[PDB]
Design a protein around this nucleic acid. Sequence first.
RNA 1: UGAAACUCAAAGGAAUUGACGGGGGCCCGCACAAGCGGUGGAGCAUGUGGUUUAAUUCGAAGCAACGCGAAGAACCUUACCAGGCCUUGACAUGCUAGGGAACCCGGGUGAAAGCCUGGGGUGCCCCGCGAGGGGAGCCCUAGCACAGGUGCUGCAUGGCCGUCGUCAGCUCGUGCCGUGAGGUGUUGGGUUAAGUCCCGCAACGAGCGCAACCCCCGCCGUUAGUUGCCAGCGGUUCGGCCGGGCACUCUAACGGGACUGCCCGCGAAAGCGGGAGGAAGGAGGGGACGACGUCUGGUCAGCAUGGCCCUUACGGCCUGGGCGACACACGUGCUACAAUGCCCACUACAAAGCGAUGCCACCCGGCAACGGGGAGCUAAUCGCAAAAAGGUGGGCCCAGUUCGGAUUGGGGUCUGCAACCCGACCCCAUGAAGCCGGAAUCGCUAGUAAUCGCGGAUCAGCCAUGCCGCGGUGAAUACG
Lengths: 60, 24, 80, 206
Amino acid sequence: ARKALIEKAKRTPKFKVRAYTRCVRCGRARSVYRFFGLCRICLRELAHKGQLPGVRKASW
Amino acid sequence: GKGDRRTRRGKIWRGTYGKYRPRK
Amino acid sequence: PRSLKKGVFVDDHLLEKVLELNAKGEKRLIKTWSRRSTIVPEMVGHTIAVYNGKQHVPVYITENMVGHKLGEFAPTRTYR
Amino acid sequence: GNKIHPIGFRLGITRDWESRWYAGKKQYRHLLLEDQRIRGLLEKELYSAGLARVDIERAADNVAVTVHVAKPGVVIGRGGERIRVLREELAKLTGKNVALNVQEVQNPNLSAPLVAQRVAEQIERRFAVRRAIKQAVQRVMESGAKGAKVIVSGRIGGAEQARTEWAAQGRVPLHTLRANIDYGFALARTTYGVLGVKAYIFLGEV
RNA sequence: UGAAACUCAAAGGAAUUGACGGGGGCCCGCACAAGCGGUGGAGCAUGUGGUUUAAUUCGAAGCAACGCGAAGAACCUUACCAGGCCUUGACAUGCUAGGGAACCCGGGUGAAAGCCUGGGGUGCCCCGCGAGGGGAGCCCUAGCACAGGUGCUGCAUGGCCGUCGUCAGCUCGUGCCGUGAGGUGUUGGGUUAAGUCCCGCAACGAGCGCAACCCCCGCCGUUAGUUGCCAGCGGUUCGGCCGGGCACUCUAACGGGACUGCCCGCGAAAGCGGGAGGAAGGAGGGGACGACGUCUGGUCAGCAUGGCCCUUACGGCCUGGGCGACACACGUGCUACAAUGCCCACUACAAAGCGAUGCCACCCGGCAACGGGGAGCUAAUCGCAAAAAGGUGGGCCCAGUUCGGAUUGGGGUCUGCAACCCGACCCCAUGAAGCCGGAAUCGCUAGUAAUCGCGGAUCAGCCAUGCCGCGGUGAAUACG
Ligand SMILES: [K+]
Ligand SMILES: [K+]
Ligand SMILES: [Mg+2]
Ligand SMILES: [Mg+2]
Ligand SMILES: [Mg+2]
Ligand SMILES: [Mg+2]
Ligand SMILES: [Mg+2]
Ligand SMILES: [Mg+2]
Ligand SMILES: [Mg+2]
Ligand SMILES: [Mg+2]
Ligand SMILES: [Mg+2]
Ligand SMILES: [Mg+2]
Ligand SMILES: [Mg+2]
Ligand SMILES: [Mg+2]
Ligand SMILES: [Mg+2]
Ligand SMILES: [Mg+2]
Ligand SMILES: [Mg+2]
Ligand SMILES: [Mg+2]
Ligand SMILES: [Mg+2]
Ligand SMILES: [Mg+2]
Ligand SMILES: [Mg+2]
Ligand SMILES: [Mg+2]
Ligand SMILES: [Mg+2]
Ligand SMILES: [Mg+2]
Ligand SMILES: [Mg+2]
Ligand SMILES: [Mg+2]
Ligand SMILES: [Mg+2]
Ligand SMILES: [Mg+2]
Ligand SMILES: [Mg+2]
Ligand SMILES: [Mg+2]
Ligand SMILES: [Mg+2]
Ligand SMILES: [Mg+2]
Ligand SMILES: [Mg+2]
Ligand SMILES: [Mg+2]
Ligand SMILES: [Mg+2]
Ligand SMILES: [Mg+2]
Ligand SMILES: [Mg+2]
Ligand SMILES: [Mg+2]
Ligand SMILES: [Mg+2]
Ligand SMILES: [Mg+2]
Ligand SMILES: [Mg+2]
Ligand SMILES: [Mg+2]
Ligand SMILES: [Mg+2]
Ligand SMILES: [Mg+2]
Ligand SMILES: [Mg+2]
Ligand SMILES: [Mg+2]
Ligand SMILES: [Zn+2]
């Protein structure tokens, strides 16, 4: 997550396409979820803390 | 077989539609 | 099985830079980076230098290739 | 590299969340980022007070932030000056008229996060790791608790060979659900590198 | 009988804990055997090695790297390369001024980025009648502290993960034994899936693990009826449509249920075999959960981090290219080679999920992909949605064939600024290899395997035949 690249937040995409997501917590671009704006790693982390409301450990 | 796009199964497998499998 | 739709795309970069170079006759070379642009009629007879990624390549565009793209003539990779 | 977070494992029972607010696929991600940003300034500030937890309830532009601490006085300030400045710093970050309760801890030796922080500090102050550990485990064990356990990472005393120090007393069944084991992780920046402290405190069951 | 020079920091003895033998006893696991279906051969998809390249960014390396990080490479992503450009900087906090600055808008050039600019405008403070002066704020320019660095080290680290392995087992306290390392306990006999429980015992207990507490599935009940229904009845555009009713089905909260309790047989016990009643019987089925520790395992490229190294460049911006090269080699898969089959009709029967600038009913246009119009749903209420395998009828008649759908030529449709490199989809034409696969090798013990389709994450679109789940039909075999 190069600071220079976390410029993604930069609305101005010039072309709506070029706009992509990134972890809002680690900057991770490679596996970010929409409903959390978090990557699979950061997501797993906070979920463990209990800081992700309603999110529990699914078993079945 | 599922690889024949010009057949029923072809379409279904590829999850598409067309002459060989129109939407009812 | 090729296809775009309606609006034979062409970067105006060179278009309005060639359709103009028609008025005062022709010219000699037009180096571009837009290999995306579709070749069209009023290009025939010209010579466009297309960037392959390392260099600009000379391309005498002729009738027989009026529908193709510019990149199609500037091969990207170098093999054996 | 095994064993799950003892809390995330116990969210169903013996353990509640640190954020209680419903939301939809359109808001959730935001009220989340913010909800975090809060813990951001907070934990970077209220450090000294010794913040053990930050619950966050929401309703609708309403924020029931409840900073838990051992020294509720560092929160307040002179007469009530801090819980004024900060309480304003919050609503500044997110214009949402935010409350900001403050609670004291009935024994900071049973706040796993704190115990971790404590030990984590002694480490930067260049204490003898094993001592700190044994001690901590003691404090906790003394002031109640049916079991406790502390873990420090490696590079103990600036050693090139990273290690891992133990120490623990009484029960600490990570496998049993209805255990109610508080847990806390404290970092530990240093002249030579990072260390990691983990605190476990077992109290009651059923 | 018996040396010396020279050379070494050991050579040795007994005992301890381990690890190990082609030592012994005892026992377990899809470990073998039994059995069912594959892979290895083909075509293609995908990852990799190797070559190639301006670059083909980096990592992962027997098991435990190779549809792995990537749950989405056309630009973006992107870390690589070529070229055109920036320099307190795309981001933070600050400082000394030479000065004008909040901001708004047009042009020159250009691939863009930039570099030049040409203007429209002056609020906020304390002054001053005013002209105007000095200051906040913000923006520029010139030096400065400093930012920034997928730049090295995973053998300096945290955190998280993998692995032996859900395999049991690993320990402590006090006592006892031994000069001591240590031993006893934890060994032994019976028994368990289990260091599970029993019995015995110089030990008596305890901790981390087993187990149990949590989730799903199976039977029943109690509140609770915008989804069930003539169950029972009255209406019928015979659509559970309307009235109507919660019985039933469901939906989802809370409880009941199983305890080897009962009977018989064997034990000394724990338990073992068997029988009843029960939806379920002796851990009912599946999951979450993986001890002290091992592999100087993996990751400095998620993030954090000590130390090194670059700081008009190892930072930053673009436009284009590359990550998509190919003589060739391997892994994982997909589609097949057909008649227990393929094709076209007609008709049945699911479960989980997802959807307000998103699912998209229905209608019209088009062979179609899709266009145009348009109802409905904040969704047990509308849409995705067809279920396919099946069942019924019909065709093909053993052929590289109505098997198979690779490759290639056309003509189109979508997404997108843009599909040459390098998208999916549709239609016409083309119609490859392939006749069941050498040596070798993988999976699975039952709703499992094998087969059939369906959804979701990522996501504009997609290179998904990959992952992660869902339900239909449903075997064989285990002497040992
Ligand atoms: K290591
Ligand atoms: K072929
Ligand atoms: Mg960074
Ligand atoms: Mg994108
Ligand atoms: Mg992304
Ligand atoms: Mg066919
Ligand atoms: Mg010697
Ligand atoms: Mg000896
Ligand atoms: Mg020995
Ligand atoms: Mg077995
Ligand atoms: Mg096997
Ligand atoms: Mg066998
Ligand atoms: Mg093969
Ligand atoms: Mg590689
Ligand atoms: Mg590396
Ligand atoms: Mg690219
Ligand atoms: Mg221009
Ligand atoms: Mg390592
Ligand atoms: Mg590590
Ligand atoms: Mg490595
Ligand atoms: Mg077990
Ligand atoms: Mg002892
Ligand atoms: Mg002795
Ligand atoms: Mg003694
Ligand atoms: Mg002992
Ligand atoms: Mg032992
Ligand atoms: Mg022993
Ligand atoms: Mg023994
Ligand atoms: Mg036990
Ligand atoms: Mg045993
Ligand atoms: Mg004993
Ligand atoms: Mg290593
Ligand atoms: Mg290795
Ligand atoms: Mg580092
Ligand atoms: Mg690749
Ligand atoms: Mg080659
Ligand atoms: Mg495949
Ligand atoms: Mg039509
Ligand atoms: Mg393309
Ligand atoms: Mg042949
Ligand atoms: Mg044949
Ligand atoms: Mg088995
Ligand atoms: Mg699918
Ligand atoms: Mg998609
Ligand atoms: Mg492709
Ligand atoms: Mg698919
Ligand atoms: Zn993340």
